[PDB]
Design a protein around this motif. Structure first.
Motif, mmCIF file in Angstrom:
data_model
loop_
_atom_site.group_PDB
_atom_site.id
_atom_site.type_symbol
_atom_site.label_atom_id
_atom_site.label_comp_id
_atom_site.label_asym_id
_atom_site.label_seq_id
_atom_site.Cartn_x
_atom_site.Cartn_y
_atom_site.Cartn_z
ATOM 1 N N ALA A 335 0.810 -1.227 0.000
ATOM 2 C CA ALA A 335 0.000 0.000 0.000
ATOM 3 C C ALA A 335 0.841 1.273 0.000
ATOM 4 C CB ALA A 335 -0.985 0.002 1.186
ATOM 5 N N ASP A 336 2.093 1.156 0.429
ATOM 6 C CA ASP A 336 3.056 2.256 0.384
ATOM 7 C C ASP A 336 4.440 1.614 0.238
ATOM 8 O OD1 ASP A 336 4.193 4.832 0.512
ATOM 9 O OD2 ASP A 336 3.432 5.271 2.516
ATOM 10 N N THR A 337 5.424 2.389 -0.213
ATOM 11 C CA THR A 337 6.791 1.891 -0.307
ATOM 12 C C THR A 337 7.398 1.665 1.080
ATOM 13 O OG1 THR A 337 7.594 4.163 -0.585
ATOM 14 C CG2 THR A 337 7.323 2.822 -2.603
ATOM 15 N N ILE A 338 8.478 0.886 1.101
ATOM 16 C CA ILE A 338 9.068 0.362 2.326
ATOM 17 C C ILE A 338 10.353 1.096 2.685
ATOM 18 C CG2 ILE A 338 10.233 -1.654 3.330
ATOM 19 C CD1 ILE A 338 8.246 -3.213 1.208
ATOM 20 N N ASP A 339 10.417 1.580 3.922
ATOM 21 C CA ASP A 339 11.569 2.309 4.415
ATOM 22 C C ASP A 339 11.703 2.064 5.921
ATOM 23 O OD1 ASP A 339 13.737 4.018 4.588
ATOM 24 O OD2 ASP A 339 12.606 5.831 4.045
ATOM 25 N N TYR A 340 12.877 1.594 6.340
ATOM 26 C CA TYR A 340 13.127 1.216 7.731
ATOM 27 C C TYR A 340 14.121 2.140 8.437
ATOM 28 C CZ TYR A 340 11.085 -3.289 6.283
ATOM 29 O OH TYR A 340 10.270 -4.279 5.776
ATOM 30 N N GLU A 341 13.759 2.558 9.644
ATOM 31 C CA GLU A 341 14.619 3.369 10.488
ATOM 32 C C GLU A 341 15.405 2.478 11.452
ATOM 33 O OE1 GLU A 341 12.476 6.452 12.541
ATOM 34 O OE2 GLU A 341 13.960 6.583 14.160
ATOM 35 N N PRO A 342 16.726 2.720 11.598
ATOM 36 C CA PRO A 342 17.463 2.013 12.650
ATOM 37 C C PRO A 342 16.805 2.269 14.008
ATOM 38 C CG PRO A 342 18.981 3.159 11.187
ATOM 39 C CD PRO A 342 17.598 3.633 10.832
ATOM 40 N N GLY A 343 16.521 1.206 14.754
ATOM 41 C CA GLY A 343 15.812 1.319 16.039
ATOM 42 C C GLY A 343 14.289 1.301 15.953
ATOM 43 N N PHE A 344 13.738 1.434 14.745
ATOM 44 C CA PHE A 344 12.286 1.485 14.553
ATOM 45 C C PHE A 344 11.918 1.060 13.128
ATOM 46 C CE2 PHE A 344 8.070 3.696 14.416
ATOM 47 C CZ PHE A 344 7.526 3.162 15.572
ATOM 48 N N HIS A 345 11.817 -0.250 12.900
ATOM 49 C CA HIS A 345 11.631 -0.793 11.541
ATOM 50 C C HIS A 345 10.196 -0.750 11.020
ATOM 51 C CE1 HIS A 345 15.530 -3.368 12.149
ATOM 52 N NE2 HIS A 345 15.806 -2.113 11.837
ATOM 53 N N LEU A 346 9.533 0.399 11.153
ATOM 54 C CA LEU A 346 8.170 0.568 10.623
ATOM 55 C C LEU A 346 8.192 0.856 9.122
ATOM 56 C CD1 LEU A 346 5.098 0.585 11.285
ATOM 57 C CD2 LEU A 346 5.304 3.060 11.732
ATOM 58 N N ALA A 347 7.734 -0.110 8.326
ATOM 59 C CA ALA A 347 7.894 -0.056 6.865
ATOM 60 C C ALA A 347 7.073 1.056 6.219
ATOM 61 C CB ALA A 347 7.559 -1.414 6.240
ATOM 62 N N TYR A 348 5.824 1.180 6.671
ATOM 63 C CA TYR A 348 4.861 2.190 6.218
ATOM 64 C C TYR A 348 3.633 2.050 7.107
ATOM 65 C CZ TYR A 348 3.084 -1.835 3.479
ATOM 66 O OH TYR A 348 2.635 -3.075 3.091
ATOM 67 N N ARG A 349 2.622 2.893 6.910
ATOM 68 C CA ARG A 349 1.467 2.896 7.820
ATOM 69 C C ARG A 349 0.133 2.508 7.179
ATOM 70 N NH1 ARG A 349 -0.390 7.131 10.413
ATOM 71 N NH2 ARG A 349 -0.632 6.264 12.528
#
Ligand SMILES: [Mg+2]
Length: 384
Positions: A335-349
């Motif tokens: 539903a949205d592109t995937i992007d991960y933060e170090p410490g918080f791997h939330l791909a999209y919402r």
């Protein structure tokens, strides 16, 4: 030129095999597909994936046994995994062992674990997105929560739902203990319990088997509420499993487009090609197959993002860092592109919402997202 070992932990025979079988098929299709098409590192070295499939039947003892086998016998650098309970239990160990872990579990508790990834929003963000859809489309109202109190998966977003609910205009009227292995009688008992509270909306946190039994029971006993299910509780089989009583009154969440709405989606066409090349009938390609395929594909994209030197030297750690350093698109399936933060791997919402239509056919509602100010993920992480 390079071979890596990858574990595939699946439930093909246990209480979540209703959705687990399709996931396993999709994961295997993806391994065979990308192997044959050719996986190349940044410096152009071909990678072959030797995957080791293990059906653990949702058994947590067996999960830990196969994990030790993957690590100690095969020295895997990545695992394509399954259940919330086992994935959570192993999360600290996979960090220690530096094994990239991509799970069917979308638990918010994984987000802070350095080696855990999944190509979807966490269960809580998904749930709150679906409930926001309900509140905006049908109004503020009363909400009942049906889930297995004993199963980590079934429990996962419940706390965050309760915390977010007031701000969504939803009054939680009760929790109802629907077993993961619910019988028809269990479903009817729960439906009759909820009927006393007359909710406008029902959430179900279990897999399609009990979700469908509940939807069918609700209609049978005369509880005319809308049912919303988590991603594993609703798919192409839902019209047939729920029956005519539920027509127009059930909604499913999915971060991934269904093949039936994705004729023109690149990633869906990629899966269809994989199926043709491996002698799998087109009608066997469904949401569960997509869910398995996209987990493997996320791994492939990570490999394509590293050098062969990096892959050989640091293995799973090279893969983790690549997943943190890049935005991913899986042929427009998510539903949205995937992007991960170090410490918080939330791909999209955001998520897709699918309706069991009045005619009994599934209908795509569109993309929906919980309000920006509602931190669904961190609500669950901070639990306890
Ligand atoms: Mg990133």
């Amino acid at each position: 030129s390079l071979t890596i070992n990858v574990g595939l932990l699946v439930d093909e025979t246990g209480p979540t095999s209703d959705v687990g079988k399709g996931y396993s098929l999709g994961a295997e299709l993806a391994f065979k597909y990308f192997n044959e098409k050719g996986i190349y590192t940044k410096d152009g070295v071909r990678v072959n994936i030797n995957y080791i499939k293990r059906d653990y039947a949702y058994n947590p003892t067996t999960a830990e046994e196969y994990y030790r086998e993957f690590r100690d016998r095969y020295g895997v650098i990545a695992i394509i995994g399954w259940g919330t309970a086992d994935t959570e239990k192993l999360s600290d160990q996979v960090d220690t062992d530096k094994i990239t872990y991509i799970s069917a579990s979308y638990s918010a508790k994984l987000l802070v674990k350095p080696f855990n990834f999944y190509p979807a929003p966490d269960y809580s963000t998904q749930a709150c997105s679906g409930l926001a859809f309900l509140a905006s489309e049908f109004g503020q109202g009363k909400l009942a929560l049906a889930y297995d109190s004993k199963v980590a998966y079934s429990r996962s977003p419940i706390g965050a739902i309760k915390k977010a609910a007031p701000s969504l205009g939803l009054q939680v009227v009760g929790d109802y203990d629907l077993p993961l292995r619910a019988t028809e009688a269990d479903a009817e008992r729960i439906a009759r319990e909820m009927l006393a509270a007359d909710p406008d909306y029902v959430w179900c946190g279990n897999t399609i088997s009990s979700c469908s039994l509940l939807g069918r029971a609700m209609a049978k006993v005369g509880l005319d509420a809308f049912l919303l299910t988590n991603v594993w509780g609703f798919d192409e089989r839902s019209p047939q499993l729920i029956g005519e009583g539920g027509y127009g009154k059930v909604f499913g969440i999915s971060p991934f487009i269904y093949p039936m709405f994705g004729q023109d989606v690149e990633g869906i066409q990629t899966i269809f090609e994989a199926a043709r090349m491996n002698g799998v009938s087109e009608d066997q390609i469904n949401l569960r197959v997509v869910q398995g395929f996209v987990n493997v594909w996320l791994l492939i994209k990570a490999i394509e993002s590293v050098t062969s030197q990096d892959l050989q030297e640091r293995g799973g750690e090279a893969l983790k860092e690549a997943l943190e350093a890049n935005t991913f698109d899986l042929g427009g399936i998510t539903a949205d592109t995937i992007d991960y933060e170090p410490g918080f791997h939330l791909a999209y919402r955001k998520v897709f919402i699918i309706k069991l239509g009045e005619n009994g056919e599934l209908q795509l509602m569109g993309k929906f997202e919980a309000p920006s100010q509602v931190d669904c993920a961190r609500y669950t992480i901070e639990e306890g």
